[PDB]
Amino acid sequence: SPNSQYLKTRILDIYTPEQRAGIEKSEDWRQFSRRMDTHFPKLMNELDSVYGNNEALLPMLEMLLAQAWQSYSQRNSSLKDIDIARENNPDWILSNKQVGGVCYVDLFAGDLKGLKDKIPYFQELGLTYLHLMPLFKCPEGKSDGGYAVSSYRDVNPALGTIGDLREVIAALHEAGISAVVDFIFNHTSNEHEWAQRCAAGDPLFDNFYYIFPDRRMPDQYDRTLKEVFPDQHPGGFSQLEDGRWVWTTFNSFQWDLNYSNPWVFRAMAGEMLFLANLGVDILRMDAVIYIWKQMGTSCINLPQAHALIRAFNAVMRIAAPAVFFKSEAITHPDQVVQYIGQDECQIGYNPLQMALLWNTLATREVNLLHQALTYRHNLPEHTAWVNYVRSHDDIGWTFADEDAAYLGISGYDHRQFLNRFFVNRFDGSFARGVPFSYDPSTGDARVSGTAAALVGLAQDDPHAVDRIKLLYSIALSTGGLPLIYLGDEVGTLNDDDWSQDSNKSDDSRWAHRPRYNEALYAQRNDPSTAAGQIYQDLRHMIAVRQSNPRFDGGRLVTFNTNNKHIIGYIRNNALLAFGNFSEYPQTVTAHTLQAMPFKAHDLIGGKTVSLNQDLTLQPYQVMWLEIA
Ligand SMILES: OC[C@H]1O[C@H](O[C@H]2[C@H](O)[C@@H](O)[C@@H](O[C@H]3[C@H](O)[C@@H](O)[C@@H](O)O[C@@H]3CO)O[C@@H]2CO)[C@H](O)[C@@H](O)[C@@H]1O
Ligand SMILES: OC[C@H]1O[C@@](CO)(O[C@H]2O[C@H](CO)[C@@H](O)[C@H](O)[C@H]2O)[C@@H](O)[C@@H]1O
């Protein structure tokens, strides 16, 4: 294998002898050269572990690092300052100061100029982090809500221009908000140029996808693949018009990119550098678990997938140190956590906590959630969870069967229950969700619907507002970067048109993707409305989280409440949180509370609470007790 110095001297060969002296003296080159020395050995080792003795490895690497230099050279000074700051503060992601939000630009604000106009509201709410849903050109009609990308460089004209996006990102930065966008790197749309050229037999785009002459290999792969959108097509493959078959994990119009080809890595690394220099702070690594395939396996969570992401990481350490990764791994908890690491994805979605929040509302029993906060919450140094309550996607019940079994719970039977409960097919349920991707091979299903819909707000259940408050309280206080699904903070209900819209009718996820509700947002300062109560509740919890150092960092220790309806945990040995998941009053006894100070201030309700006696929580009450 080559070395950092060799590669750098060749990178510099593009310059005249005179220019070259100016380059090597420059501050940009000095930073690049030391980051090369520090981080290139990781890049080389990760790529070697995947591609081995591949003839194209060295040429690809040289091409990539030449592009990395050009990119860093071009990178504007303000981003270069953020590079230095995050280079010396790996734990910026772990600060209690951070609170995130996510929205569709079109649905929430019409277009990018409109989004820029909403930035004062984001500041009002207290966001420091904003994820904008996929922005770029995609097929008209059905594009999986923009996740079928037809060009990585062209903004969807309905949203505006690439210049508009650069301005939004600058404006977010001026408002103290990090910009977060999707890195859609497992697949492109079938109308993407790479996809067209590859299928047409253009040598330049040879092996950019997985294309087969017939069903022989697809059938063999499909023996072990687990379907993602079972309504859409069987297995993992779709047929071309000419009779061939292409790997399509998701929709038929989404074709998996072939990372066994090192030129595909270079292509997407190139795209990563492009987004970096737009000033993107965090890249959402979409569908991370699918980027390596192997016959005889489920083709998810494979070792090469992890190595490839660690390779991407090193590219950012070299040419855009500010750019962090957020893992989207919705899979078994044992596998979810393997993506999270300083040298891989520094943060990742926490689907286990999310799914168990909803589980606990249904059962009123904190057993699985306590188990999860006890054994699966704490992370390696310099990493964090992203804690959420809802997202643009369905809810999957991705708790571990092994975990549940230890508690005498059958995972299969339990999911059968949860899936009936949350779509209002269980006696007494407050939930008004909609099924998604029922699967006749597994009996599996997921749940669509907004947070407000799932807690009972549609029928104005008197407990609805408190349920929302409780759920968000836990994401805001367990440790990690909390992510608000924008619209939830005023109690936004399910979309009313999705089911009869022919572009949407086969995808119930659109139920929980409503437009900005003008009426609700106008009520947000009136505490007599559900919108105002939710908003003031959440805003208060956000303010406390961000101001109070007891919430800092990602670590927690659970507290045994000895009440199966009440969750308990302690942050920084100074903040005792209780959450009552029962619709009835529930008590933590004086005996349980013996080690606590006699009195403690509750940050939620503002009162001084006695802990030297029974503590009785009202229905769905949350307490944040300052015990040190
Ligand atoms: O809030 C209503 C109800 O929810 C909880 O009970 C549910 C269980 O959590 C759930 O697992 C499921 O129980 C079934 C088992 O999974 C299955 O193995 C077999 O033993 O039959 C059970 C019933 O079908 O469904 C129940 C609810 O029916 C919670 O524990 C209850 O206290 C609560 O009243
Ligand atoms: O300056 C380094 C050294 O590189 C040699 C080639 O062996 O020339 C290379 O570097 C030059 C300056 O960057 C380039 O103009 C040239 O294309 C490249 O081959 C020597 O010419 C030079 O002394």
Ligand SMILES: OC[C@H]1O[C@@](CO)(O[C@H]2O[C@H](CO)[C@@H](O)[C@H](O)[C@H]2O)[C@@H](O)[C@@H]1O
């Ligand atoms: O309201 C049901 C609505 O959901 C859509 C597609 O998302 O189908 C979902 O619900 C069905 C059960 O009603 C499931 O069989 C299906 O797998 C699930 O995606 C529509 O098919 C349906 O009209």
Ligand SMILES: OC[C@H]1O[C@@](CO)(O[C@H]2O[C@H](CO)[C@@H](O)[C@H](O)[C@H]2O)[C@@H](O)[C@@H]1O
């Ligand atoms: O601490 C005294 C008394 O409290 C009991 C309740 O089971 O334990 C509780 O006290 C500890 C104080 O931090 C907690 O760590 C524990 O989780 C909590 O349940 C008994 O363990 C003990 O006798």
